[PDB]
């Protein structure tokens, strides 16, 4: 193939009918293949038997993405500069209600665009630059318009390095399949030399240029643009030219100092970010590690070492492969990358890291739910791709007899447990709520489960939270309050419209959501675990790995023989996770507003967006539409004719798209065939169809168009439901 091989055509092939699997697209026409090929455009069974390139392709695809983010966000940073909102907001923050983005007025459009601002019509934003942003001190719109093109610079170039691979004559095996350094480098000087470098441009420049912003001015009444070198008088305030120390060390005297740092603990008052000053120290104290750390090392060495009696021989040469699986060294990653994103989602809302967040409610919960769906959308993946390992990747058997070969040894076992785990949960983890209804609708509270009724009695108080703030008995020194303000001990005092941050004390009715999470996190994983484990051969099929991780279903026999596979375990596992996350979101905002998100008022009488309705009334799972869905959402179905309106006006579509999924999810296949011909007939009479044999959806494509829609349906529904109950009161 042979248009024409090797040596002797530069001449490209566009044309003669084109390619895949060897009874290649037929010649003779079909539809499905147009759906094939976007799908499974890369799988890597095909293109070559021999890994050869592909690692030589996946470096390039990676380059494309890095550019693209860059194309992105130049865009963003643009938008952010020259449709400003920002200059205006910053003198002005805690008045402003901020936009980057504006429509043009054509047809309806422009209901949308409603006064945001330092006096301009806007669409209000809830990702915050304007808060990443506070940091730049120097300011002004045309720069961000430099940071912007600085973006388009990185891109074109960090996108001609992708020419400067695959397409260019390009690289070979050793380079990846000798690993020996790679984390050495990465973590040492970038992980390090960023955070390090970030330190250097995180007190140099930023600290001072918001050290005396947290007062007001009209900027540049404060900051010259370069201003900040050989110079510096200004460091003098924010501290000394080290005055006489030497390269740290000690024969140093302070009668009154210790270098910038000086740790913060708690939140700024009048910018309650948390101190802009533990922010240098912490990043500095990072990098070092990485700076020292990325200095291992070259490998099996450590992995081949420790063994135990249960413990695994396999552990050793736990994978010559690992260097060349790929699909496995992506699956591992996603679990981490993914599980290391939604750990953001907490440390964020219970410890803001940007100036003006919390007061800014809606511009950091959007966040805590966007970052939340990735620390989930990337985890089910982190299973799929292991399934993609577990079936195929190595030519041959020679992994042999380990730790894995071990885990599999039991397998109707690791998943034998985990199962009961879930029905123990569920019964202790949902029908728990249903008690309440059945008995509060029967009505006898004496015996509910209410935080008042079934006795723990009125304290949450001591577990960890109370040991955590309360923190300095300790080898701990530091800082007037907490690591996180929310923890029980301490403080009234945070912020200027509004409440930002307060204990959150829980009790029960934090107790049992916290448990539904368990059962939801667990039966999610059951299906993926048992899915990826039983990947290749099963008690129902042995001849099971033979085409596929995909195949539709083996065949009507054995009783059912349908779902099986593991595309589909990574099809019914998404289906859950959509809840896993979809109900964790439902948790946070009902809390964070029922308690916390606030207002301060004279003598500080806190006024929670809802006076804690949560109390006795989440425990009832109707209260979850009495107090939630039917209570809030009244802002979604009132939202017409306004400015945000695009939410209420989405909330019907996408609350439609979902209720279109079921058609794709719930239906046969030779059905829409049987139909597609009646069609095809009427077509031929007028002479208008045959060519490119119109065909119904590819059993599993149909499932691909379930799910995917069920999610972008059922999801943006709340993306709307949300942005519509924090914009406007809250």
């Amino acid at each position: 193939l042979v248009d024409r091989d090797p040596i002797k055509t530069s001449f490209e092939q566009w044309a003669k009918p084109g390619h895949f699997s060897r009874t290649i697209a037929k010649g003779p026409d079909t539809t499905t293949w147009i759906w094939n090929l976007h799908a499974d455009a890369h799988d890597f069974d095909s293109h070559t038997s021999d890994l050869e390139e592909i690692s030589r392709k996946v470096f390039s695809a990676h380059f494309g993405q890095l550019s693209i983010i860059f194309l992105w966000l130049s865009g963003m940073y643009f938008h952010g500069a020259r449709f400003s909102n920002y200059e205006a907001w910053l003198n002005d923050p805690t008045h402003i209600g901020p936009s980057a983005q504006v429509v043009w007025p054509i047809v309806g459009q422009e209901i949308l665009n409603g006064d945001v601002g330092g006096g301009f019509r806007g669409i209000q934003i809830t990702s915050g630059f304007f808060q990443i942003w506070r940091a730049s001190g120097i300011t002004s719109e045309l720069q961000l318009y430099c940071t912007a093109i600085g973006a388009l610079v990185f891109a074109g170039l960090m996108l001609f390095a992708g020419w400067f691979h695959y397409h260019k004559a390009a690289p070979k095996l050793a380079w990846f399949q000798d690993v020996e350094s790679m984390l050495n480098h990465h973590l040492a000087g970038l992980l390090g030399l960023g955070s390090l470098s970030w330190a250097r441009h995180q007190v140099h420049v930023s600290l001072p240029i918001n050290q005396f912003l947290n007062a007001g001015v009209d900027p540049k009444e404060i900051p010259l643009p370069h201003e900040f070198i050989l110079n510096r008088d200004l460091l003098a305030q924010l501290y000394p030219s080290f005055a006489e120390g030497a390269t740290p060390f000690f024969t140093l005297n302070w009668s009154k100092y210790a270098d910038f740092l000086t740790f913060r603990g708690g939140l700024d008052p009048l910018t309650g970010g948390l101190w802009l000053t533990d922010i240098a120290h912490h990043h500095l104290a990072i990098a070092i590690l990485f700076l020292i750390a990325g200095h291992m090392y070259r490998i099996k060495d450590i992995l081949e070492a420790h063994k135990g009696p249960f413990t695994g021989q396999g552990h050793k040469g736990l994978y010559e492969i690992l260097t060349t699986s790929w699909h496995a060294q992506l699956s591992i990653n996603l679990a981490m990358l993914g599980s290391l994103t939604i750990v953001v989602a907490q440390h964020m809302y219970s410890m803001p890291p940007y100036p003006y967040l919390a007061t800014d409610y809606a511009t950091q919960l959007s966040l805590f739910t966007h970052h939340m769906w990735i620390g989930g959308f990337l985890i089910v993946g982190a299973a799929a791709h292991a399934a993609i390992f577990m079936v195929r990747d190595y030519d041959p058997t020679t992994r042999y007899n380990d730790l894995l070969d071990r885990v599999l040894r039991h397998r109707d076992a690791i998943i034998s447990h985990l199962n009961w785990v879930c029905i123990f949960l569920g019964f202790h983890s949902f029908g728990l709520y249903i008690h309440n209804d059945t008995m509060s609708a029967l009505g006898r509270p004496q015996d509910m489960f209410s935080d008042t009724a079934i006795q723990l009695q009125p304290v949450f108080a001591q577990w960890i939270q109370n040991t955590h703030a309360l923190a300095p008995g300790t080898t701990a020194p530091g800082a007037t309050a907490s690591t996180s303000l929310t923890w029980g001990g301490g403080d009234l005092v945070a912020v200027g419209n509004k409440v930002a941050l307060l204990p959150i004390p829980l009790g029960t009715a934090d107790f049992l959501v916290h448990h539904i999470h368990a059962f939801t996190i667990h039966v999610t994983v059951l299906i993926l675990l048992k899915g990826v484990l039983f990947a290749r051969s099963s008690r129902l099929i042995p001849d099971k790995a033979n085409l596929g991780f995909r195949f539709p279903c083996d065949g009507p026999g054995r009783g059912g023989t349908c779902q099986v596979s593991a595309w589909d375990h990574v099809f019914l596992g998404l289906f859950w996770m959509y809840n896993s996350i979809s109900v964790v979101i439902f948790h946070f905002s009902w809390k964070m507003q029922s308690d916390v998100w606030g207002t301060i008022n004279d003598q500080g009488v806190v006024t929670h967006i809802t006076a804690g309705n949560f109390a006795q009334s989440s425990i009832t799972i109707n209260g979850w539409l009495r107090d939630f869905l039917w209570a809030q959402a009244s802002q979604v179905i009132q939202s017409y004719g306004s400015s945000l309106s695009a939410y209420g006006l989405f909330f019907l579509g996408a609350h439609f798209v979902w209720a279109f999924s079921l058609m794709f999810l719930f239906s046969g296949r030779g059905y829409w065939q049987e139909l597609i011909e009646s069609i095809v007939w009427a077509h031929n009479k007028l002479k208008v169809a045959p060519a490119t044999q119109p065909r119904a959806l590819s059993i599993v494509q149909g499932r691909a168009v379930g799910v995917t829609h069920y999610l972008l349906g059922g999801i943006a529904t709340t993306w709307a439901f949300f942005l519509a109950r924090i914009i406007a009161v809250g």
Binding site: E244, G245, A246, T247, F249, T251
Partner: protein
């Protein structure tokens, strides 16, 4: 220069122990874990002899006593010869 020059002599002190210490601590490696303390090959006591770090913690102390009086509590003496 300054106490800071005494400090130049002193970068030499931290830099020093650590590095001068360094080779011994690596020099027969592939020990991994462990020692004279544990399995096969006793001789008893503790010992007296051999270096890397027995001798330099001592040095931060040396620097200390001489340095010591000079700044201090205006600093002995005590003489005795005075000196005679």
């Amino acid at each position: 220069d300054f106490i800071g020059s005494p400090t130049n002599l002193i970068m030499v002190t931290s830099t020093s122990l650590m590095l001068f210490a360094g080779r011994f601590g690596l020099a027969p490696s592939a020990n991994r874990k462990a020692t004279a303390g544990l399995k096969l090959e006793v001789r008893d006591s503790g010992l007296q002899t051999g270096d890397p770090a027995g001798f330099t913690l001592a040095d931060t102390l040396a620097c200390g006593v001489v340095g010591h009086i000079i700044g201090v509590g205006v600093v002995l003496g005590l003489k005795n010869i005075g000196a005679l």
